[PDB]
Design a protein around this ligand. Structure first.
Ligand SMILES: N[C@@H](CCC(=O)N[C@@H](CS)C(=O)NCC(=O)O)C(=O)O
Ligand SMILES: N[C@@H](CCC(=O)N[C@@H](CS)C(=O)NCC(=O)O)C(=O)O
Lengths: 208, 208
């Protein structure tokens, strides 16, 4: 295959890219590296880190760059400058939430999970609930009727946050419905079931 | 003026955008707001944060989305898909260094500045020295002869690290020459002189 995605055997940073590839029926080698095997190959990557997408002869690190590249190549990058900018802005906001999430998971799970759920996460979700409403009244996908790369990022972020706090979307009807809509896309539902069967952890420390 | 960039009165995340606009001679309102005045306007921004670029009637937050929007408008986003991906990937690496730098600055300046300078920074710069070589032998700009948005981000990151450690580029000749090449661009030379004269803070806590 001409695509290989190299990452750890967790959802982590790679998962939005995996979701994009699966939902767009782009076949790829899902090259999942065990933690102890990474030091031997680390210098092969331009910043010594994963994920890495090999796209033919091109070696592309940086999760944001990988997803934006795929979006251009497969016409999931919006239809005009305003759209392209908007989904970039939106997806970058998703990455900011993921930074907060990961800091709590890796650095302070036992003490910071509950204050995160109660006192950080709701305000962050509220920003997305408001923003989502600006296209299609937020009642379909981020750009309205046409899927874009940002939808996969938002879906994964909402999904991992529901694992963390099953009630977190209760009071955010647009986000709750978006998550429902995405999970019901058949290629994503099938893949979710394979991923559950494989007992894939969200994060590298087994907490979630 | 039709372009307005709103950020705090520090370099921070806005500075690569300011550098883009200054170097490209895109006249803009440099809207620098005081810490204490942000609360009253925070809800006007899609994630409650700055920087924000107003481009005519378009309000764009997220520094990376702002930069890529400007890059598309002004043809500083590469000439083909591979270049577009490359500069993004490069810029994302710069942002990762900036995350490390800012964690040190804001969380541990008094005890971890010296370890950062000695033990973290050199290996991080080495990754850039190596990657920069891939186009134009690394002897000009990131894409070779043509400027891109990533050049401004790299320039700023090298500049703030030389403030931190004046000797940090001693062992990285491509980076050292690149930093000087950028600073010698006429619009940047003038701007940087004035920025230095005013001792514009790099960071919001005045440490650098
Ligand atoms: N900005 C990066 C971050 C990549 C990153 O932090 N990678 C981590 C895994 S989540 C890693 O490769 N750690 C292994 C190491 O540094 O040895 C990206 O979005 O791809
Ligand atoms: N991912 C964002 C980060 C924006 C951000 O962290 N903004 C900070 C300044 S560095 C801010 O507006 N702080 C004000 C606040 O949250 O009250 C971007 O690149 O623009």
């Amino acid at each position: 295959m001409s695509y290989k995605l190299t990452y750890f055997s967790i959802r982590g940073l790679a998962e939005p890219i995996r979701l994009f590839l699966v939902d767009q029926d782009i076949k790829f080698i899902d090259d999942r590296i065990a933690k102890d095997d990474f030091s031997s190959i680390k210098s092969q990557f331009q910043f010594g880190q994963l994920p890495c997408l090999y796209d033919g002869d091109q070696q592309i690190v940086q999760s944001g760059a990988i997803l934006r590249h795929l979006a251009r190549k497969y016409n999931l990058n919006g239809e005009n400058e305003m759209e392209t900018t908007y989904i970039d802005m939106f997806c970058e906001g998703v990455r900011d939430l993921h930074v907060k999430y990961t800091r709590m998971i890796y650095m302070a799970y036992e003490t910071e999970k509950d204050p995160y759920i109660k006192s950080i996460l709701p305000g962050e979700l509220a920003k997305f609930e408001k923003l989502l409403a600006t296209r299609g009244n937020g009642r379909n996908l981020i750009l309205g009727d046409k899927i874009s790369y940002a939808d996969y990022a938002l879906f994964e972020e909402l999904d991992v946050h529901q694992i963390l706090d099953p009630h977190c979307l209760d009071k955010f009807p647009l986000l709750k419905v978006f998550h429902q809509r995405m999970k019901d896309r058949p290629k994503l539902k099938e893949y979710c079931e394979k991923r559950d069967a494989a007992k894939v952890p969200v994060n590298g420390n087994g907490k979630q």
